[PDB]
Design a protein around this ligand. Structure first.
Ligand SMILES: Nc1ncnc2c1ncn2[C@@H]1O[C@H](COP(=O)(O)OP(=O)(O)O)[C@@H](O)[C@H]1O
Ligand SMILES: Nc1ncnc2c1ncn2[C@@H]1O[C@H](COP(=O)(O)OP(=O)(O)O)[C@@H](O)[C@H]1O
Lengths: 152, 152
């Protein structure tokens, strides 16, 4: 029964974390901040099928922006517009969440406000001196939904 | 509490129908089968923000195909390719559902198979002779999810 599946998923939202359901960084389709939005680049982005694509600088873990596919709607590929022009214009908010965040809290946070994607990070204390934020992956509302409705 | 919201939504899936949650036809962003995928047309489709766009012929209620935004990934706007070339190539399946279908059944049907959009229709017996299928709107998995998780 659908109803009991959902209810069990609902009960697990208290104890599961965003880290449990996230798309880890090595499974993310991302794009370098240096990119040029020529025809082939926009074509790869549309082929990927994702609504939103993290933008990184230098290393994949250094996520600095989010590119939405809808941000290419007025881009003429003939212009070879740098991606930077587009991320500076739209400036989509970039939200971060800790890996130990519980899915009930995450769901609450996605339900309030427009953003349904957060970058998952943890505090890396295993220095090497200074503690820093280590980016692990992304988590969206759909990751949480899937945990609620999936068969188990 | 998130958990009780979800559980109540789950309990209502038995009695709510696809008609209760659908996007009615007058609220749908659609495209005519005659369209040409020149730059401005592809630009309107990407600006709309929808992953999938019903294609109609003649009247809005005569839905004959579904265009996915990802189907424009290799389309060069300079070619002025008719939309028909693209819908004949990809041929995305078009699924129909009756308006009195319950959301638990709908959710079951979206969970099995790739399609997460159905065209909602009802049997129009108020002829005028012959009974026909009257298209009312579309319903996607997200419409059902929203009914499960929304605050109430
Ligand atoms: N750029 C991306 N790279 C890889 N996976 C992604 C990306 N964006 C979203 N996802 C993942 O895809 C799944 C579906 O998420 P959803 O938010 O519906 O995104 P989309 O609409 O782009 O499919 C989730 O597991 C989510 O973490
Ligand atoms: N072409 C469209 N026109 C209008 N509404 C649509 C269209 N496609 C989906 N929707 C509606 O948008 C809401 C979100 O659905 P979803 O399946 O997430 O589509 P999308 O990824 O395109 O936002 C639902 O209420 C759904 O019925």
């Amino acid at each position: 029964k659908e109803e009991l599946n959902i209810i069990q998923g609902a009960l697990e939202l208290r104890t599961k974390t965003v880290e449990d359901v996230m798309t880890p960084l090595r499974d993310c389709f991302m794009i370098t901040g240096e990119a040029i939005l020529d025809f082939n680049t926009m074509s790869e982005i549309m082929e990927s099928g994702y609504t939103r694509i993290p933008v990184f600088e230098g290393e994949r873990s250094n996520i600095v922006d989010l590119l939405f596919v809808k941000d290419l709607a007025f881009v003429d590929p003939d212009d070879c517009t740098p991606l930077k022009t587009i991320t500076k214009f739209y400036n989509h908010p970039l939200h971060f969440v800790f890996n130990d965040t519980k899915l009930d809290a995450m769901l609450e946070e996605f339900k309030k406000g427009k953003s349904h994607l957060a970058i998952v990070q943890r505090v890396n204390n295993e220095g090497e001196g200074d503690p820093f934020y280590e980016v692990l992956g992304i988590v969206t509302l759909e990751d949480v939904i899937e945990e609620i409705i999936k068969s188990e």
